Design a protein around this ligand. Structure first.
Ligand code: HEA
Ligand code: HEA
Ligand SMILES: CCCCCCCc1cc(O)c2ccccc2[n+]1[O-]
Ligand SMILES: [Cu+2]
Lengths: 607, 178, 70, 256
């Protein structure tokens, strides 16, 4: 309680700082060219700068957690205000960090590589940001205004309603993700239509090239694995608020049914956080290598396998609860059938880097380090797929050690790779290469001495979600080593922000823009392409530019202030149902009232 | 040419998983009510609800084909789209008095775990058909200062085909829950 | 004119559905929607349009027959 | 420790995969600085890596079902295992006995652990016995175990965290046959009826012997609604800030 009193003042200070320094006059720059803007380039920016903000929020969280877990009998954090702490850390990632960080790198890089103007509905994509953001402030305001949930990012049902007890805990998780799920659902719908009907002439479907293909796969899984989340929480939101008994222990409802609904959405979304990560790494390793992605009838054909085989594998997170054995081997054999379509994509990055040249720049290093660390986590998930041995290392850190290798090397590195390799798109010049190398090395070495002792921590006998281990066979140092490496990755986020204080060998339509920071209309003429890689065939082979006297008109999808007002209603009704208001919501119905009024304005505005 | 016909179409594919999630929820919560009321609902109301909706699409499969596509019955839009709008209230009015009559033993979602799924598998079900009325009437404000021609006023078609998607699970609810 | 033939054929499936109660009955439900939606998909934007809805019912079988599978 | 041979044998299987990719990068790359038929022929090995596990792993999933690490279809001992919050409950239907946060089993004997819970989902891990099974509040899950050598087997929970869940460590032991029957005889407190309800509060407890079985109470494996008749009959529902301490109304057996 003592710690949470300083940040509410710091939270009010930051709010008080925006008024004096920034709000001298903002209804001409903040409300016009931003907030409710339509240009796809500006939206993708607002996605990742929230993920960096959540990185520090997730950062002080991840650090003080392991700082508490330095050694046994440590009195930094108590039983609770750790459960809430470690729950906020995990939900801030994936949902409010890796999702906005990935879609942001998608909401920017994909529409330029296809030659189109904006996206399909540059109007519905506007609210698609705020729909996530009001869910971010909802889940962030659980800080001191209410109480952050303390059931994990999973938050199973039997420990979530009355057995749990905190009122304003799970509701932020239910209503916070319920909104962002609506926003994230529309981001998959916009980009599923943008990459199918707005491509430029000559841009053939089979070659466009491969990252824009992974994004296509990313925005397909979102469409079919988010309506589940929309009802899985809505069912849970009915259990919590309106008094439903879908999974309640009392009226006899199935406590495990909410587990299977969450995971029917769970593991498919797990690939939504790794699909764009694969794509962002597919260009960079074939761009500064100056070679051809050798393999398409077996690499893009491999990107479709994991897209469907993600829903025949989701039952691998259970196993321990004693299923029908046969059904515990079905998804066990099937899970091994998911590490093979994922496996061939690693053999496709090394033979596109061989025979070809290379220059170790900063974005190369992130692609250099992505190859091993993701496999070291992948050579452990194969073990997790074995249901017969999953019962021994279920939970117990060895699971935590598996996936932290999979996602941080997978997505967090791709979030860092897409950060630097496509930074000249965002503003002038780029990051300093030599001192940017200092951030790469320190963040990489602390990553392993943090989670590889967890492979020994978990196998020796340290379960997960535990605030004190105890002197068990001298297994204290493996825990402290994990914390040293944990606090070591923190050292670096200061460097990451210092590199920001300073304020190429392309092979696709990246540097093909008229100059740095491409304009609003993006590309005056649509490229003919008619080949696999556009930039190299449009540099050495001929020239081909944007000749004058061949221009035409504008797009004119101007701004409308409704998406901001639309999501505030979602954030207002969401906050109103969470913070007290147990049975029914006095203001929760108004948010429903305001949203439907704007949905009439949706089809009452001619443009 | 408007791609919203395709964009708000892949949104209709997402709701298949929405209702399938509720169908998986409901089909697992079928054998409960270990302590509560056993389900016994009126049979004639089911066919009356289903036949009202099966006749709702019968006035809508031809409500745009022999309307805008075949010939040009521009005056019939206040005829075919209004009659099909009153049939939407028939399902709403019948399902509301069905829930109010269920206040008599088995009210809302608190009586049993089974009635929680049914009041939600048919709950957001009833919500989807209620907002469609306001969406079908939302386009009916176009024959005033607008009055667009076919192949241009896509609001009718994109809202007509959304309205069609209901009867899909509506029939799957007929077989699913009954 | 041509759409009335399917609409007239659709009403009999519900009447035969009541005759089943008052696989063999899990198919008449899917077949009732085939004729209903086959009058508004292809083409132009088709192939993609009628293709989007195909893999959604797979999840319905995977989600339903998969949840019941436990 | 039956599946431990998979862990050690599989450990080297991926230890090779980690070094295979060391030969695929370090051997070149340095030599290569400025200063279609292979992919199709590659599809023969990846199933060979997984089908060599998609048979012995499936030959093990069906192996933990029937009577495993014990003997044959004899000596059937039943032990009803219940999981309240933080605290572990185990009751023997053979003779009127029931222990809490402690468990004794004779070595080289089959034990049909009936796994269940009271208020929150759980699972008896016990890192020396091997596999764990979730304690599902609402039904009983069967699970058989045994004892390798005589020793001290640590035991914990799946730790579905809930304030008092990290200290769910309950110690279990495995001794001989002759000492088990003398130990069982010495015991016969009893099933004090009300002290059972004095257990569903999540706190901290000591040994609590109890020489009478509690399964005469709604089975507990069935009708998991015993969370309302538990915490609420003594007047207690916790919160997150202030006014906890089990909202007044005393009577219990705590620490110190
Ligand atoms: C995107 C995925 C992702 C990312 C990036 C991270 C980031 C980190 N995580 Fe975690 N983690 C999860 C995924 C992730 N995590 C998940 C899914 C859970 C479980 C969720 C749940 O079930 O509740 C979890 C919880 C979890 C656990 C397991 C908890 C347990 O079992 O008891 C551990 C183990 O130590 C951990 C450690 C770290 C560390 C050291 C980082 C580092 O990357 C830290 C990153 C920090 C920065 C980049 C900024 C550093 C901050 C500073 C420099 C500020 C310092 C200033 C002051 C202290 C004043 N986090
Ligand atoms: C980016 C997200 C992501 C990705 C891509 C993966 C990828 C994989 N994961 Fe995992 N996983 C998670 C996110 C992810 N996972 C999360 C978040 C959890 C914990 C959730 C929670 O409980 O909170 C988890 C936990 C988890 C479980 C559940 C454990 C439990 O029951 O508690 C399982 C079970 O099968 C698993 C296995 C796998 C496998 C086999 C792959 C495969 O796709 C990996 C493919 C890679 C390889 C197979 C190695 C590379 C291949 C080669 C080098 C070719 C040669 C190799 C062979 C021939 C084997 N991981
Ligand atoms: C920073 C920070 C610090 C805490 O003590 C927290 C406690 C609970 C939940 C979230 C928390 N966050 O985010
Ligand atoms: Cu998974």
């Amino acid at each position: 309680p003592l710690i949470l009193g300083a940040q509410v003042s710091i939270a009010l200070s930051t709010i008080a700082i925006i008024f004096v320094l920034t709000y001298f006059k903002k209804w001409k720059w903040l409300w016009s060219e931003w907030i409710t803007t339509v240009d796809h380039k500006k939206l993708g920016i607002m996605y990742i700068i929230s993920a960096v903000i959540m990185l520090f929020r997730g950062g002080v969280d991840g650090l003080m957690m392991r700082a508490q877990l330095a050694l046994p009998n440590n009195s930094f954090l108590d039983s609770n205000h750790y459960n809430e702490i470690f729950t906020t850390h995990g939900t801030i990632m994936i949902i409010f960090m890796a999702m906005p960080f990935l879609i942001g790198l998608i909401n920017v890089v994909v529409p330029l590589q296809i030659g189109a103007r904006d996206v399909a509905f540059p109007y519905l994509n506007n609210l698609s940001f705020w729909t996530f953001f009001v869910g971010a402030m909802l889940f962030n305001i659980s800080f001191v205004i209410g109480g952050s949930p303390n059931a994990g990012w999973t938050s199973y049902m039997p420990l979530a309603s009355n057995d749990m007890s905190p009122g304003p805990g799970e509701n932020y998780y239910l209503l916070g993700l319920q909104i962002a799920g609506i926003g994230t659902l529309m981001t998959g719908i916009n980009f599923m239509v943008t990459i199918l009907k707005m491509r430029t002439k000559g841009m053939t479907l089979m070659r466009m090239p491969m990252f824009t293909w992974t994004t296509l796969i990313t925005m397909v899984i979102i469409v079919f694995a988010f309506p589940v989340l929309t009802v899985a929480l809505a069912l849970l939101s009915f259990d919590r608020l309106f008094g439903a008994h879908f999974f309640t222990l009392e009226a006899g409802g199935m406590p495990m049914l909410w587990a299977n609904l969450f995971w029917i959405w769970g593991h498919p979304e797990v690939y939504i956080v790794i699909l764009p990560a694969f794509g962002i790494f597919s260009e960079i390793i074939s761009s500064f290598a100056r070679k051809q992605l050798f393999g398409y009838k077996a690499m893009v054909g491999s990107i479709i396998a994991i897209s469907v085989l993600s829903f025949l594998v989701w039952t691998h997170h259970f196993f321990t609860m004693g299923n029908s054995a046969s059904v515990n081997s079905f998804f066990s054999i099937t899970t091994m059938a998911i590490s093979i379509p994922t496996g061939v994509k690693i053999f496709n990055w090394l033979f596109t880097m061989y025979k070809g040249r290379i220059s170790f720049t900063t974005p190369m290093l992130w692609a250099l380090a992505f190859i091993p660390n993701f496999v070291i986590g992948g050579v452990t998930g194969v073990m997790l797929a074995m249901a017969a041995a999953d019962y021994q290392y279920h939970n117990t850190y060895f699971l935590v050690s598996h996936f932290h290798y999979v996602l941080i090397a997978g997505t967090v590195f791709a979030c860092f790779a897409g950060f630097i390799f496509w930074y000249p798109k965002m503003f002038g010049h780029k990051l300093n290469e030599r001192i940017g190398k200092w951030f790469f090395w320190i963040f990489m070495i602390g990553f392993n001495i943090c989670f590889f002792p967890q492979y020994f921590l978990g196998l020796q006998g340290m379960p997960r979600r535990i605030y004190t281990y105890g002197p068990n066979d001298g297994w204290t140092t493996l825990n402290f080593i994990s914390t040293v490496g944990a606090f070591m990755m923190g050292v670096g986020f200061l460097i990451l922000c210092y590199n920001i204080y300073y304020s190429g060998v392309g092979r696709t339509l990246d540097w093909a823009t008229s100059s740095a920071i491409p304009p609003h209309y993006n590309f005056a003429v649509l490229p003919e392409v008619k080949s696999q890689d556009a930039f190299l065939h449009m540099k050495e082979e001929k020239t081909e530019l944007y000749p004058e006297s061949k221009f035409k008109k504008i797009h004119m999808p101007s701004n409308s202030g409704r998406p901001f007002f639309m999501s505030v209603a979602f954030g207002l009704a969401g906050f109103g149902l969470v913070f007290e208001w147990y049975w029914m919501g006095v203001v929760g119905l108004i948010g429903v009232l305001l949203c439907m009024v704007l949905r009439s304005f949706e089809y009452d505005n001619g443009y | 040419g408007r791609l919203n016909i395709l964009g708000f179409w892949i949104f209709l594919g997402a709701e298949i998983v929405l209702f399938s999630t509720l169908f998986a929820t409901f089909f697992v919560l079928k054998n409960r009510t270990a302590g509560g009321v056993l389900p016994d609902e009126l049979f004639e109301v089911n066919l009356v609800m289903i036949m009202t909706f099966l006749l709702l699409i019968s006035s809508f499969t031809c409500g745009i084909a022999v309307h805008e596509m075949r010939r040009g019955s521009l005056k019939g839009v206040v005829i075919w789209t209004i009659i099909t709008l009153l049939l939407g209230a028939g399902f709403v009015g019948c399902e509301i008095n069905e829930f109010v009559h269920y206040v008599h033993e088995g009210a809302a979602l608190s009586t049993s775990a089974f009635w929680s799924g049914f009041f939600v598998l048919l709950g957001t079900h009833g919500t989807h058909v209620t907002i469609g009325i306001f969406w079908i009437t939302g386009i009916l404000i176009q024959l005033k200062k607008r009055g667009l021609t076919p192949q241009t006023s896509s609001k009718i078609f994109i809202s007509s085909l959304y309205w069609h998607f209901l009867d899909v699970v509506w029939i799957f609810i007929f077989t699913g829950v009954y | 004119x041509x759409x009335x033939x399917x609409x007239x054929x659709x009403x009999x499936x519900x009447x035969x559905x009541x005759x089943x109660x008052x696989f063999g009955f899990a198919f008449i439900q899917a077949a009732l929607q085939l004729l209903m939606f086959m009058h508004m998909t292809e083409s132009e934007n088709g192939t993609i349009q009628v293709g989007n809805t195909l893999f959604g019912f797979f999840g319905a079988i995977v989600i339903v027959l998969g949840s019941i599978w436990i | 420790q039956q599946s431990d041979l998979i862990l050690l044998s599989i450990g080297f299987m991926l230890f090779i995969v980690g070094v295979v990719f060391v030969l695929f990068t370090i051997i070149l790359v340095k030599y290569r600085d400025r200063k279609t038929f292979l992919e199709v022929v590659w599809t023969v090995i990846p199933i060979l890596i997984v089908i060599a596990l998609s048979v012995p792993t499936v030959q093990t999933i069906y192996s933990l079902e029937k009577a495993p690490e014990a003997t044959k279809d004899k000596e059937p001992l039943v032990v009803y295992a219940t999981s309240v919050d933080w605290k572990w409950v185990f009751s023997y239907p053979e003779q009127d006995i029931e222990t809490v946060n402690y468990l004794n089993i004779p070595v080289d004997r089959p034990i049909l652990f009936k796994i269940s819970s009271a208020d929150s989902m759980a699972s008896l891990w016990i890192p020396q016995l091997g596999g764990q099974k979730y304690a599902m509040a609402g039904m009983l899950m069967d699970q058989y175990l045994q004892a390798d050598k005589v020793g001290t087997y640590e035991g914990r929970n799946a730790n579905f965290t809930g304030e008092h869940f990290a200290d769910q460590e309950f110690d279990v032991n495995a001794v001989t046959e002759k000492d088990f029957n003398s130990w069982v005889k010495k015991t016969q407190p009893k099933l004090t009826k009300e002290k059972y309800d004095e257990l569903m509060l999540p706190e901290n407890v000591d040994e609590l012997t109890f020489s009478s079985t509690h399964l005469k109470y709604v089975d507990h494996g069935q009708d998991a609604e015993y969370a309302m008749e538990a915490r609420k009959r003594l007047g207690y529902q916790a919160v997150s800030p202030h006014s906890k301490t089990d909202p007044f109304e005393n009577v219990k057996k705590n620490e110190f």
